Every structure is written in structure tokens, then in C-alpha cells.
């Protein structure tokens, strides 16, 4: 009955948008185990260009999120078939490089989410002090 | 066996410091129900001076935290004996106005926690752009 779901990401400066995406992945089926992969500092910097929080900070924050059952930290940058087999993953949740997952029936799209980001908070605060 | 713990707060711009405090409250005993009270916008503004996120945002963020079993939103600003009786609360977790809780054996102190705040994040980012 239990279904293993994998979601990966940087999860830098986690906010409600990330949390809602994790909730959706967790609730894809009635009984799930949600495994979350957290990308390494060096690969995030190399492939995205930057990262604010360390792997330890980003992972420690995810530990506190209700929907996260297990964490792989750091995770591989690219999901492989062998990785799915090693961790007995049934589906990869995502918000092309993933065509092979779709051809296998292992790709689950989650709906776009919005949250109140660090940016949104700063802008809201500063609006009280200047136009 | 089950122990009802109550923690209250503003929980504005929640970060690891808040999350660790909630984890400590949740883990005070082996089997707990952690009830979290979220203060109203108007009382927070009146008694603290300001609040960034709405009650809805602050409560919705707490819904995603692993340790939070139940939420009272909004909660009363001041805990009363009748409130403890109404919600069958055994202990109030806190990081004087609370002497009556201590005299009853219902006060549980949690250890001070630190986190990476919105402020810490902004300062860390800006250090890359100016001294």
C-alpha cells in the first residue's frame, strides 16, 4: 500500500511555497513515504550560480517540516535509474531531462505554489519606511 | 500517558529558532500533544508594537511544522486557568506573569535556541555586495 515519493531541490531560504510543494508530494497517494533530496553546496553554486544557506542549514530546516519523512543530504544533482532502484522510489515529484521518468510512469507533476518569501517580507517591511 | 503541552507566541517570520523551540516543547515528555497558540494581529500590534505577517500567514506556516499537533488561532494574549481547563492543557512551555503556572507545576522552561533569521539571511547576502 505504501508508495515512496522522491522530491529534490535546493530548498534555499525555505518558505510557504516550498512547504506547499512538499505537502502536495506527500499527499499524492493515501499512504506515502516522502524522501527529500537536498543538493550540495558546490553543485548548487556551479549549476545555479549561487546559494545562501549551507547544506547543513537547508537540511536542518527541512527536518522540521511535517511532510518530510526521510532526507538524502546531499542528493545527486541528476536522478538516475540506479538511484530510483537503490532507494526503492516509486515516483519523482516535480513542479526534456525528465522524459525518461514520464515514459516509465514515475513522474508526478505538482501544481505551482506561491509563498511569502524573504523578498516579499523585506519589501512589505520597507514599504512602511519609504515609497 | 499522553500529555497536552501548550506554547503560544507571535511566530512572525518563523525560522529555525522558533522551530527548535517547538521541537523542544513537543519532546518534553515521551507522548505529547503540542497545542500552539498564535496571537492576533491587533493584540500583537498593540502590545508588541508591530507585526509583519498576518494571522493567516503565521498560522498557515505553523501548519507545516512537524511538531505542531493542534493550533489555536487566534489565541488569547494572556493564559488563564480557565483556558488551561477548557483545552485540558497539562503544561505551558516557555523559553512574574507566569508565577501562578510555576506554583501549579504546569510551567516548563525550554532552553534558548538560535536560528538563521530573515535578518541573518539579508546580512549574509549583502556582505557579497558591500563591506
Coordinates of C-alpha atoms in Angstrom, one line a residue:
Chain A
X1 CA 0.0 0.0 0.0
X2 CA 2.9 2.4 0.8
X3 CA 4.3 4.5 -2.0
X4 CA 7.8 6.0 -1.9
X5 CA 7.9 9.6 -3.4
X6 CA 11.1 11.4 -4.1
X7 CA 11.4 15.2 -4.4
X8 CA 14.7 17.1 -4.8
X9 CA 15.7 20.7 -4.7
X10 CA 18.0 23.3 -3.3
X11 CA 15.5 24.4 -0.7
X12 CA 17.4 27.6 -0.1
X13 CA 15.6 30.0 2.3
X14 CA 12.6 27.7 2.6
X15 CA 9.2 29.4 2.6
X16 CA 5.5 28.5 2.2
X17 CA 5.9 27.9 -1.5
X18 CA 8.4 25.1 -0.8
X19 CA 6.3 23.8 2.1
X20 CA 3.1 23.6 0.0
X21 CA 5.1 21.8 -2.8
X22 CA 6.3 19.2 -0.2
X23 CA 2.8 18.8 1.1
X24 CA 1.5 18.1 -2.4
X25 CA 4.2 15.5 -3.0
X26 CA 3.4 13.9 0.4
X27 CA -0.3 13.7 -0.4
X28 CA 0.0 12.3 -3.9
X29 CA -1.4 9.0 -2.6
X30 CA -3.1 7.9 0.6
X31 CA -0.1 6.2 2.1
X32 CA 3.3 7.6 1.1
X33 CA 6.9 7.9 2.3
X34 CA 8.3 11.3 1.1
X35 CA 12.1 11.2 0.6
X36 CA 13.5 14.7 0.0
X37 CA 16.9 15.2 -1.6
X38 CA 18.9 18.4 -0.8
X39 CA 21.5 19.5 -3.3
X40 CA 25.1 20.0 -2.3
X41 CA 26.6 23.5 -1.9
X42 CA 29.2 23.0 -4.6
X43 CA 26.8 21.7 -7.3
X44 CA 24.2 24.3 -6.5
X45 CA 26.8 27.1 -6.8
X46 CA 28.2 25.5 -10.0
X47 CA 24.9 24.8 -11.8
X48 CA 22.6 27.5 -10.4
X49 CA 25.2 30.2 -9.8
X50 CA 24.7 30.8 -6.0
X51 CA 23.3 29.5 -2.7
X52 CA 22.7 31.4 0.5
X53 CA 22.3 28.7 3.2
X54 CA 24.7 25.8 3.7
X55 CA 23.7 22.2 3.2
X56 CA 23.5 21.8 6.9
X57 CA 21.2 24.8 7.4
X58 CA 19.0 23.8 4.4
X59 CA 18.7 20.2 5.6
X60 CA 18.1 21.1 9.3
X61 CA 15.2 23.3 8.2
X62 CA 13.6 20.5 6.2
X63 CA 13.9 18.2 9.2
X64 CA 11.2 20.4 10.9
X65 CA 8.7 20.1 8.0
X66 CA 5.7 17.8 8.7
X67 CA 5.6 16.2 5.3
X68 CA 9.2 15.2 5.1
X69 CA 9.7 11.6 6.1
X70 CA 13.3 11.0 5.1
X71 CA 16.1 13.2 3.7
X72 CA 19.0 12.4 1.4
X73 CA 21.6 15.2 2.1
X74 CA 23.4 15.8 -0.1
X75 CA 21.5 14.3 -3.0
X76 CA 22.7 13.7 -6.6
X77 CA 22.2 16.6 -8.9
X78 CA 20.7 14.3 -11.6
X79 CA 18.3 11.4 -10.8
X80 CA 19.4 8.1 -12.4
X81 CA 17.5 4.8 -12.8
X82 CA 20.0 3.2 -10.4
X83 CA 19.2 5.8 -7.8
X84 CA 15.5 5.0 -8.0
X85 CA 16.3 1.3 -7.6
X86 CA 18.7 1.9 -4.7
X87 CA 16.1 3.8 -2.7
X88 CA 13.0 1.9 -3.9
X89 CA 11.5 5.1 -5.2
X90 CA 8.1 4.7 -7.0
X91 CA 7.6 8.3 -8.2
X92 CA 9.6 11.5 -8.5
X93 CA 7.5 14.6 -7.7
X94 CA 8.2 17.7 -9.8
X95 CA 6.6 21.2 -10.1
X96 CA 13.1 17.2 -21.5
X97 CA 15.5 15.9 -18.8
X98 CA 12.6 14.1 -17.2
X99 CA 11.1 12.4 -20.3
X100 CA 12.6 9.0 -19.2
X101 CA 10.6 9.3 -15.9
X102 CA 7.4 10.1 -17.8
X103 CA 7.9 7.2 -20.1
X104 CA 8.1 4.9 -17.1
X105 CA 5.1 6.3 -15.3
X106 CA 7.3 7.5 -12.4
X107 CA 6.8 11.3 -13.0
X108 CA 4.3 13.1 -10.9
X109 CA 3.7 16.8 -11.5
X110 CA 2.7 19.0 -8.6
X111 CA 0.8 22.2 -9.1
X112 CA 2.6 25.6 -8.9
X113 CA 2.6 27.1 -5.4
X114 CA 3.1 30.6 -4.1
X115 CA 4.5 31.7 -0.7
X116 CA 5.7 34.7 1.3
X117 CA 9.4 34.8 0.5
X118 CA 12.2 36.5 2.3
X119 CA 12.0 39.0 -0.6
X120 CA 8.3 39.6 0.0
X121 CA 8.9 40.1 3.7
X122 CA 11.6 42.7 3.2
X123 CA 9.5 44.6 0.6
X124 CA 6.5 44.6 2.9
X125 CA 8.6 45.9 5.8
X126 CA 10.3 48.6 3.8
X127 CA 7.0 50.0 2.4
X128 CA 6.4 51.4 5.8
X129 CA 9.6 53.5 5.6
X130 CA 9.8 54.7 2.1
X131 CA 7.7 54.7 -1.1
Chain B
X1 CA 0.1 8.5 29.1
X2 CA -0.5 11.4 26.8
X3 CA 0.5 14.9 28.0
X4 CA -1.0 18.1 26.5
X5 CA 1.6 20.9 26.1
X6 CA 0.6 24.5 25.2
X7 CA 3.0 27.0 23.6
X8 CA 2.0 30.5 22.5
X9 CA 3.7 33.2 20.5
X10 CA 3.5 35.6 17.6
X11 CA 5.6 33.3 15.3
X12 CA 6.2 36.2 13.0
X13 CA 8.6 35.3 10.1
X14 CA 9.2 31.8 11.5
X15 CA 12.8 30.5 11.4
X16 CA 14.9 27.7 12.9
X17 CA 14.9 29.3 16.3
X18 CA 11.1 29.1 16.5
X19 CA 11.2 25.6 15.0
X20 CA 13.7 24.3 17.6
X21 CA 11.6 25.8 20.4
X22 CA 8.5 24.0 19.2
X23 CA 10.6 20.7 18.9
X24 CA 11.7 21.1 22.5
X25 CA 8.1 21.7 23.7
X26 CA 6.9 18.7 21.7
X27 CA 9.6 16.5 23.2
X28 CA 9.2 17.4 26.8
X29 CA 7.6 14.0 27.5
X30 CA 7.6 10.7 25.6
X31 CA 3.9 11.1 24.5
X32 CA 2.6 14.6 24.0
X33 CA 0.1 16.7 22.1
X34 CA 1.6 20.1 21.4
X35 CA -1.1 22.8 21.0
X36 CA 0.3 26.1 19.6
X37 CA -1.5 29.4 20.1
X38 CA -0.9 32.2 17.6
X39 CA -1.5 35.7 18.7
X40 CA -4.0 38.0 16.9
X41 CA -2.8 40.8 14.6
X42 CA -4.4 43.6 16.7
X43 CA -3.1 42.4 20.1
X44 CA 0.4 41.8 18.7
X45 CA 0.4 45.3 17.2
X46 CA -0.9 46.9 20.4
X47 CA 1.3 45.0 22.9
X48 CA 4.5 44.4 20.9
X49 CA 4.3 47.4 18.6
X50 CA 4.3 45.7 15.2
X51 CA 3.8 42.5 13.2
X52 CA 4.9 41.7 9.6
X53 CA 2.8 38.6 8.7
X54 CA -1.0 38.3 9.0
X55 CA -2.6 35.8 11.4
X56 CA -3.5 33.7 8.4
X57 CA 0.1 33.6 7.1
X58 CA 1.7 32.9 10.5
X59 CA -0.8 30.1 11.2
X60 CA -0.5 28.6 7.8
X61 CA 3.3 28.4 8.2
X62 CA 2.9 26.6 11.6
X63 CA 0.6 24.1 10.0
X64 CA 3.6 22.8 8.1
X65 CA 5.8 22.3 11.2
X66 CA 6.3 18.6 12.2
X67 CA 6.0 19.2 16.0
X68 CA 2.7 21.1 15.9
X69 CA -0.2 18.9 16.6
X70 CA -3.0 21.5 17.0
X71 CA -3.3 25.2 16.6
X72 CA -5.4 27.8 18.4
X73 CA -5.5 30.8 16.1
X74 CA -6.0 33.4 17.3
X75 CA -5.1 32.6 20.9
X76 CA -5.6 34.7 24.0
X77 CA -2.8 37.1 24.8
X78 CA -2.8 36.0 28.4
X79 CA -3.2 32.4 29.5
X80 CA -5.8 31.9 32.2
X81 CA -6.6 29.0 34.5
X82 CA -10.0 28.6 32.7
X83 CA -8.2 28.4 29.4
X84 CA -6.0 25.5 30.7
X85 CA -9.1 23.7 31.9
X86 CA -11.1 24.3 28.7
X87 CA -8.3 22.7 26.5
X88 CA -7.2 20.1 29.0
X89 CA -3.7 21.5 29.0
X90 CA -1.2 19.9 31.4
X91 CA 1.9 22.2 30.8
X92 CA 2.7 25.6 29.3
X93 CA 6.1 25.6 27.5
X94 CA 8.1 28.8 27.7
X95 CA 11.6 29.9 26.7
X96 CA 6.5 37.2 37.1
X97 CA 3.4 36.9 34.9
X98 CA 3.9 33.1 35.0
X99 CA 4.5 32.6 38.7
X100 CA 1.0 31.0 39.0
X101 CA 1.9 28.4 36.4
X102 CA 5.1 27.6 38.3
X103 CA 3.3 27.3 41.6
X104 CA 1.0 24.7 40.0
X105 CA 3.8 22.7 38.4
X106 CA 2.4 23.5 34.9
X107 CA 5.4 25.7 33.8
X108 CA 8.0 24.0 31.6
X109 CA 11.1 26.1 30.5
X110 CA 12.6 25.3 27.2
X111 CA 16.3 26.1 26.5
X112 CA 17.2 29.2 24.4
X113 CA 17.5 28.5 20.7
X114 CA 19.2 30.2 17.8
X115 CA 18.3 30.2 14.1
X116 CA 19.1 31.8 10.8
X117 CA 16.6 34.7 10.7
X118 CA 15.4 36.8 7.8
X119 CA 17.8 39.4 9.2
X120 CA 20.7 37.0 9.2
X121 CA 20.0 36.0 5.6
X122 CA 19.8 39.5 4.3
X123 CA 23.1 40.4 6.0
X124 CA 24.8 37.4 4.7
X125 CA 23.7 38.1 1.1
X126 CA 24.6 41.8 1.3
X127 CA 28.1 41.1 2.5
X128 CA 28.9 39.8 -1.0
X129 CA 28.0 43.3 -2.4
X130 CA 29.3 45.8 0.1
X131 CA 31.5 45.9 3.2

